[PDB]
Design a protein that fits this description.
- The structure is cut from a larger assembly and holds chains A (63 residues), B (136 residues) and C (386 residues).
- Helices cover 22% and strands 19% of the residues of chain A.
- Chain A is of the alpha+beta class.
- In chain A, strand 1 (4-5) and strand 2 form a beta hairpin.
- Chain B has a single domain (15-136), classed as Ribosomal Protein L14, CATH 2.40.150.20.
- Chain B is built from two helices and nine strands, in the order βββββββββαα.
- Chain B has helices spanning 119-124, 126-131; strands at residues 16-17, 21-24, 32-38, 50-51, 56-60, 73-79, 84-85, 91-94, 98-101.
- In chain B, strands 2-3-5-6-9 form a five-stranded mixed barrel. In chain B, strands 1-4 form a two-stranded antiparallel sheet.
- By secondary structure, chain C is mainly β.
- Chain C has two domains: 16-81 and 203-220 and 270-384, Translation factors (Elongation Factor Tu (Ef-tu), domain 3, Beta Barrel); 82-202, Ribosomal Protein L3, Chain: B, domain 2, CATH 3.30.1430.
- Chain C is built from five helices and 15 strands.
- Chain C has helices at 111-114, 141-152, 187-195, 228-231, 372-379; strands at 41-42, 44-58, 70-79, 83-94, 97-105, 156-162, 177-183, 201-202, 213-219, 222-226, 267-270, 273-285, 320-324, 334-339, 355-358.
- In chain C, strands 1, 4, 5, 6, 7 and 8 form a six-stranded antiparallel β-sheet that branches.
- Chain C is globular and about 80 Å long.
- Classes of the chains: A alpha+beta (63), B mainly beta (136), C mainly beta (386).
- At the A-B interface, strand 3 of A face strand 8 of B.
- The complex binds potassium ion (K) and magnesium ion (33 copies).
- Chain C binds three RNA strands through strand 2, strand 3, strand 4, strand 5 and strand 7.
- It is classed as ribosome.
Chain lengths: 63, 136, 386
RNA sequence: UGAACAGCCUCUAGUUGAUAGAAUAAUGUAGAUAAGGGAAGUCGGCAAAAUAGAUCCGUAACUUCGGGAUAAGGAUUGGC
RNA sequence: UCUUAAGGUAGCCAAAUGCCUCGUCAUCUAAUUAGUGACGCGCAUGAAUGGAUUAACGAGAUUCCCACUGUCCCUAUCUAC
RNA sequence: CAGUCAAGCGUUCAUAGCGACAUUGCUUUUUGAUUCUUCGAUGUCGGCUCUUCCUAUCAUACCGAAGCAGAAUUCGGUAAGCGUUGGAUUGUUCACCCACUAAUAGGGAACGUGAGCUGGGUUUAGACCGUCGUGAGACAGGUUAGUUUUACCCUACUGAUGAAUGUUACCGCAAUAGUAAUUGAACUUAGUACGAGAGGAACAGUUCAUUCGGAUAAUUGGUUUUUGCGGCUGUCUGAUCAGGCAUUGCCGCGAAGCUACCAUCCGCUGGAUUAUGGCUGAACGCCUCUAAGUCAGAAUCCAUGCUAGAACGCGGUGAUUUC
């Protein structure tokens, strides 16, 4: 019962939701859904995807 | 699972059937392992024996040291790459399929493991757990 | 000649015929064995499958790796508004079988149960039980005579109950009527427990308790006509097969010069009566209880209903049963929950379950918030201004 | 458009013909997609997939010296 | 020594030709009645009834490898008719 | 494939296990023998797929015997309930090997199964080779290429309706038929019993797993005409906006539904028996599990439980047409 944070979108991950990905260098990425997993696998920059936490932080939205 | 295995393994989704070539994660000299059998597998018509994380398999070496090639030897699967679900609800997977050459008792032929190792594999195989670096 | 490679049979010959069940309400075919010492009680209950959700709990299983660790489990919610007792049946033992002797109904019946006796309720003059209600004219002497007959005869006593379907988010309006056996106490005690519970309601917490193992009796989801590949699970034929590959290649030998009853053949899949057993009750929730979904570890003020409601069902306003795993039947389907037929001491039973968290994210998509307060606190202010 | 009488869209001209309506079971015929594995399938990789244009690199054995050769194997490509 | 008209030369080979036969050895594989390379008393190879080789070519036959994939593990789902 | 006898083997010893010389049978899964059926045609090998049956039992249950300390084995009884695999080479049946496994037992069903497939083989016409033949040609010799047709009828089977019973509605019973779960590992027992040592168990308990079955879709994954949102090419609507067409234009994501040991859950407890071991106990003053009587006791049987519900089996109950 730990609420994790999506490594791409910054979404909160509740138990049993999404996937966990272990990269070859043993770095762990958590994804809330297959949308975040797919954009990460497509090598999209989270800072250039308008609805992510990094994007809104970088462009100072809702602050 | 099998000889030298510490305890029982809760079921993991099978991702590696017979004929799968998985990377070789130790420093024995082999570059890959060709899965030819899975220890403890059941019997069903047309159903391939398939391995998962923490399973002992019988494998051959197709790339690597010539003294390691052309032989049948045990191996333990240390990274799966097929998504599996732990009891705590997490579905996870690695990039690649990896295993380490073992003896039938469960001691690693090599002395180091390259890359991460699944937690189920480390809990089953103490020699793998002691030789491993980062576990998941 | 012989088969040349052994393979187990496809399917189960004890679930035949794979035909549509005679009714949408699967019948309870065996009740728990009576114990005259215990107090008089119901043996089963009626409810409606709402949907499934997810929980997290600590596991108490010594010797297992996940002992004292958190486990995510699927559960099924059944909406169980209190049933209304409207009748009592007496059953006498005969060399031909258990035979109904008589039925006694309550003085007043509701419209939702009177609808069950009509195919066209709107056209009807609604004359049902009008002359029967006159048996209570002076002192219900006819009712007393029939109850006396049930006490004198009738080794087995069952009560007729009906659902309160009006309290569910269903369009049906026609309540379900069922017989539920009474276990405990003498025959006279059972007859009394029916008589002072006519037109009264029975709550689900008076029948089922926390951690109890119960059975689910329901008709399964319908799928219409199915071929053998999915109705029986046979091997698909090769890609090169002329005139179809979703078939059984050999449906019999030359002799016997017939197709066997045991050969897999296409036909109706689903809509079968199923009695599934050993489902553990994880929560008995109350309708008149805000924070149904709040636990000891949570204290997050939320009901059991997911955001946007249970998909295709609606919202849970009544009492409910949370059973581990899945039960036969689809959402909105009438399901009968029966007490366990035997005493289970397998230590997978009789293990006290304390929930830590109940999932209430939307099931209409990839729900990422549990409450609207959580959603508003995460997303901040939107253009839509409340 | 494009190397193009290729494929795709349009102008002039011509046609709008081929029994229809309703519903979307199984099995088909035609078209597709698939986690992980990757020929373990099968008599046999049958069938399908993968490759593919152009530019610039880089191309072995062998050879009748003409070839092999687009060998193999790589990089790039829009708009303004 | 017997007998022929003369006794199979150069080559080539369990070959699309070798019965025995799944020949023996090696290689290829975890494992090969398959493939390849050798061997040759060759049931019954062999020189324009052409022998041996051979670059290039082939909707010819065959074996292995890389890639690739629903061929398969093991199925599922969708569209039109 | 099984039996009878018992020379001999088995340190000692015919019969723990074997068992020569002989000899009695059984079976029809080999190959022959025959020519009764079919030549106005019964599609002729194998494999794939799928069901069932047999037992002469490989494994699993319970047992008896051993040259059974233990472990591991071997012989045998009840027993076919339940399983009996993945591959390399071969068209192969067979074989052989690799490997897992509790085990990789043997057979039948028109050498089960071609309007089920496939077409590798065999099995027309093309072609090559070797031998044979003057030759045309021959070759259960090799090689290569060679159209696999029809169900809409009857029955069977799988599912689906349905007249008739005063009508109609609801709640039920239960005859009959079906039936299901299976196997392993790890921990503990225990480095204990046993054994000089070497080695090395079992019952009770606990946690998982295999094979199978029934369901289910919270989650993860797959699927996409949600043609839902966005993107991209070509062309057309003068441009913009917004769209058409490219037989679903293509790409990304994609709810819902469906769905996967690719996901999750669940798969009962009583009685009577077999083999076998017994008690009491004669026959036969003794003995004896048997003759009378009787006690335990198997993956067996029958119930419990589960599925269907006789459309010519039954019950209870509601209303039963005022012009
Ligand atoms: K999905
Ligand atoms: Mg097969
Ligand atoms: Mg065909
Ligand atoms: Mg959902
Ligand atoms: Mg131009
Ligand atoms: Mg056009
Ligand atoms: Mg047309
Ligand atoms: Mg795939
Ligand atoms: Mg193969
Ligand atoms: Mg072959
Ligand atoms: Mg092709
Ligand atoms: Mg070349
Ligand atoms: Mg010579
Ligand atoms: Mg080969
Ligand atoms: Mg050769
Ligand atoms: Mg020769
Ligand atoms: Mg040509
Ligand atoms: Mg004759
Ligand atoms: Mg005839
Ligand atoms: Mg004739
Ligand atoms: Mg015929
Ligand atoms: Mg026997
Ligand atoms: Mg094969
Ligand atoms: Mg035949
Ligand atoms: Mg045919
Ligand atoms: Mg036939
Ligand atoms: Mg042929
Ligand atoms: Mg010919
Ligand atoms: Mg019965
Ligand atoms: Mg299923
Ligand atoms: Mg147009
Ligand atoms: Mg066109
Ligand atoms: Mg005695
Ligand atoms: Mg009836």
């Amino acid at each position: 019962m730990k609420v994790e944070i999506d490594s791409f979108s910054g979404a909160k991950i509740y138990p049993g939701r999404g996937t966990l990905f272990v990269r070859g260098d043993s770095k762990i990425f958590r994804f809330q859904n297959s949308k975040s997993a797919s954009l990460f696998k497509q090598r999209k920059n989270p800072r250039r995807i308008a609805w992510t936490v990094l994007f809104r932080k970088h462009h100072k939205k809702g602050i | 699972s099998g000889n030298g295995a510490q305890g029982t393994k809760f079921r993991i989704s099978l991702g590696l059937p017979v004929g799968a070539i998985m990377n070789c994660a130790d420093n024995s000299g082999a570059r890959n392992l060709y899965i030819i059998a899975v220890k403890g597998s059941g019997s069903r018509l047309n159903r391939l024996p398939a391995a998962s994380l923490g399973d002992m398999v019988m494998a051959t070496v197709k790339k690597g040291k010539p003294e390691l090639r052309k032989k049948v030897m045990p191996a333990i699967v240390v990274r799966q790459a097929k998504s599996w679900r732990r009891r705590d609800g997490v579905f996870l997977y690695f990039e690649d399929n990896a295993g380490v050459i073992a003896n039938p008792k469960g001691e690693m032929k090599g002395s180091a493991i390259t890359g991460p190792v699944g937690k189920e594999c480390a809990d089953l195989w103490p020699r793998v757990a002691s030789n491993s670096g980062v576990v998941v | 000649s012989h088969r040349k490679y052994e393979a187990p049979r496809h399917g189960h010959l004890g679930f035949l015929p794979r035909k549509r069940a005679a009714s949408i309400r699967a019948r309870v075919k065996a009740f728990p064995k009576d114990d005259r010492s215990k107090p008089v009680a119901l043996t089963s209950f009626l409810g409606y499958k709402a949907g499934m959700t997810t929980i997290v709990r600590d596991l108490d299983r010594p010797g297992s790796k996940f002992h004292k660790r958190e486990v995510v489990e699927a559960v099924t919610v059944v909406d169980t508004p209190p049933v209304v007792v409207v009748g009592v049946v007496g059953y006498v033992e005969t060399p031909r079988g258990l035979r109904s002797l008589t039925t006694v109904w309550a003085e007043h019946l509701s419209d939702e149960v009177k609808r069950r006796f009509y195919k066209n309720w709107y056209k009807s003059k609604k004359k049902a039980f009008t002359k029967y209600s006159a048996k209570y004219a002076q002192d219900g002497a006819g009712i007393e005579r029939e109850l006396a007959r049930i006490k004198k005869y009738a080794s087995v006593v069952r009560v007729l109950v009906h659902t309160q379907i009006r309290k569910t988010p269903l369009a049906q309006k026609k309540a379900h009527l069922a017989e539920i056996q009474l276990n405990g106490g003498s025959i006279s005690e059972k007859v009394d427990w029916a008589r002072e519970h006519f037109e009264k309601t029975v709550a689900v917490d008076s029948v089922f308790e926390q951690n109890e193992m119960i059975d689910a009796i329901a008709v399964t989801k319908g799928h219409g006509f199915e071929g053998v590949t999915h109705r029986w699970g046979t091997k698909k034929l090769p890609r090169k097969t002329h005139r179809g590959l979703r078939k059984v290649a050999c449906i019999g030998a030359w002799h016997p010069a017939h197709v066997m009853w045991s050969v897999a053949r296409a036909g109706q899949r689903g809509y079968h009566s199923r009695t599934s057993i050993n489902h553990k009750i994880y929560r008995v929730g109350k309708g008149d209880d805000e924070a149904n979904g709040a636990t000891s570890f949570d204290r997050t003020k939320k009901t059991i209903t997911p955001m946007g409601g249970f998909v295709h069902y609606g919202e849970i306003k009544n009492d409910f049963i949370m059973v581990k795993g899945c039960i036969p039947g689809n959402r909105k389907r009438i399901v009968t929950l029966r007490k366990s037929l035997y005493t289970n001491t397998s230590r997978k039973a009789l293990e006290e379950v304390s929930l830590k968290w109940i999932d209430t994210a939307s099931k209409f998509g990839k729900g990422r918030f549990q409450t609207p307060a959580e959603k508003h606190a995460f997303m901040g202010t939107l253009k839509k201004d409340l």
